[PDB]
Protein backbone atom coordinates (compact mmCIF):
# COMPACT_ATOMS: atom_id res chain seq x y z
CA UNK A 1 0.00 0.00 0.00
CA UNK A 2 1.06 3.61 -0.72
CA UNK A 3 -0.13 6.71 1.13
CA UNK A 4 0.09 10.21 -0.34
CA UNK A 5 1.98 12.50 2.03
CA UNK A 6 2.44 16.25 1.52
CA UNK A 7 6.11 16.85 0.56
CA UNK A 8 6.15 20.10 2.59
CA UNK A 9 4.91 18.12 5.69
CA UNK A 10 7.81 15.63 5.33
CA UNK A 11 10.18 18.59 4.83
CA UNK A 12 8.83 20.34 7.96
CA UNK A 13 9.07 17.08 9.96
CA UNK A 14 12.65 16.62 8.67
CA UNK A 15 13.49 20.13 9.88
CA UNK A 16 12.00 19.40 13.31
CA UNK A 17 13.92 16.13 13.56
CA UNK A 18 17.13 17.84 12.48
CA UNK A 19 16.60 20.54 15.12
CA UNK A 20 16.29 17.87 17.90
CA UNK A 21 19.25 15.97 16.44
CA UNK A 22 21.40 19.12 16.81
CA UNK A 23 19.99 20.04 20.21
CA UNK A 24 20.53 16.71 22.03
CA UNK A 25 24.37 16.90 21.68
CA UNK A 26 24.35 20.22 23.51
CA UNK A 27 22.32 18.64 26.38
CA UNK A 28 24.48 15.51 26.49
CA UNK A 29 27.70 17.63 26.84
CA UNK B 1 2.90 18.24 -4.07
CA UNK B 2 2.56 14.76 -2.61
CA UNK B 3 5.12 11.95 -2.19
CA UNK B 4 3.90 8.33 -2.47
CA UNK B 5 5.12 6.61 0.69
CA UNK B 6 4.94 2.92 1.45
CA UNK B 7 2.47 2.32 4.32
CA UNK B 8 5.07 0.08 6.04
CA UNK B 9 7.54 3.01 6.04
CA UNK B 10 4.91 5.28 7.65
CA UNK B 11 4.21 2.54 10.20
CA UNK B 12 7.95 2.33 11.00
CA UNK B 13 8.14 6.14 11.21
CA UNK B 14 5.10 6.26 13.49
CA UNK B 15 6.61 3.65 15.79
CA UNK B 16 9.95 5.49 15.90
CA UNK B 17 8.17 8.76 16.78
CA UNK B 18 6.15 6.97 19.51
CA UNK B 19 9.31 5.52 21.06
CA UNK B 20 10.77 9.05 21.33
CA UNK B 21 7.46 10.38 22.69
CA UNK B 22 7.30 7.66 25.33
CA UNK B 23 10.86 8.46 26.50
CA UNK B 24 9.64 11.78 27.98
CA UNK B 25 8.65 10.46 31.46
CA UNK B 26 12.11 8.87 31.97
CA UNK B 27 13.91 12.01 30.83
CA UNK B 28 11.77 14.41 32.94
CA UNK B 29 11.32 12.47 36.20
CA UNK B 30 14.84 13.17 37.58
CA UNK C 1 25.80 8.18 35.54
CA UNK C 2 23.64 11.29 35.42
CA UNK C 3 24.00 14.53 33.43
CA UNK C 4 22.77 17.79 35.02
CA UNK C 5 20.42 19.34 32.47
CA UNK C 6 18.87 22.78 32.65
CA UNK C 7 15.09 22.45 33.16
CA UNK C 8 14.53 24.99 30.34
CA UNK C 9 16.48 22.72 27.95
CA UNK C 10 14.29 19.73 28.95
CA UNK C 11 11.21 21.92 28.44
CA UNK C 12 12.46 22.87 24.94
CA UNK C 13 13.24 19.20 24.21
CA UNK C 14 9.80 18.12 25.42
CA UNK C 15 8.11 20.70 23.23
CA UNK C 16 10.18 19.66 20.20
CA UNK C 17 9.26 15.99 20.78
CA UNK C 18 5.56 16.93 21.14
CA UNK C 19 5.61 18.86 17.85
CA UNK C 20 6.94 15.75 16.07
CA UNK C 21 4.39 13.55 17.88
CA UNK C 22 1.52 15.82 16.88
CA UNK C 23 2.60 15.71 13.20
CA UNK C 24 1.50 12.04 12.98
CA UNK C 25 -2.19 12.67 12.02
CA UNK C 26 -1.16 14.92 9.09
CA UNK C 27 1.43 12.43 7.85
CA UNK C 28 -0.89 9.38 8.15
CA UNK C 29 -4.25 10.76 6.95
CA UNK C 30 -3.39 10.70 3.21
CA UNK D 1 16.84 24.67 37.87
CA UNK D 2 18.79 21.50 36.96
CA UNK D 3 17.35 18.01 36.54
CA UNK D 4 19.46 14.85 36.75
CA UNK D 5 19.01 12.78 33.60
CA UNK D 6 20.51 9.32 33.05
CA UNK D 7 23.35 9.68 30.49
CA UNK D 8 22.44 6.30 28.93
CA UNK D 9 18.79 7.56 28.48
CA UNK D 10 20.04 10.66 26.59
CA UNK D 11 22.35 8.39 24.55
CA UNK D 12 19.46 6.02 23.72
CA UNK D 13 17.21 8.98 22.81
CA UNK D 14 20.04 10.39 20.63
CA UNK D 15 20.27 7.04 18.84
CA UNK D 16 16.51 6.99 18.25
CA UNK D 17 16.56 10.55 16.93
CA UNK D 18 19.51 9.75 14.69
CA UNK D 19 17.67 6.70 13.33
CA UNK D 20 14.62 8.88 12.36
CA UNK D 21 16.94 11.56 10.97
CA UNK D 22 18.47 8.94 8.61
CA UNK D 23 15.14 7.33 7.77
CA UNK D 24 13.17 10.45 6.72
CA UNK D 25 15.51 11.17 3.73
CA UNK D 26 14.74 7.74 2.33
CA UNK D 27 10.96 8.45 2.60
CA UNK D 28 11.30 11.95 1.14
CA UNK D 29 13.17 10.58 -1.96
Q: Residue D5: its chain C contacts at CB < 8 A?
A: 2-5, 10
Residue C29 to chain D, least CA–CA distance (Å)? 16
Resolution of this deposited model, Å: 1.5
DSSP 3-state of A12: helix
Q: How many CA atoms lie within 13 A of A14 on its CB side?
A: 14
Q: Residue C13: its chain A contacts at CB < 8 A?
A: 20, 23-24, 27
Experimental method, per PDB record? X-ray
3-state secondary structure D1-26: CEEEEEHHHHHHHHHHHHHHHHHHHH
Q: Is D28–A7 a contact, with Cβ atoms under 8 angstroms apart?
A: yes
Amino acid sequence: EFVKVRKKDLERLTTEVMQIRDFLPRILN
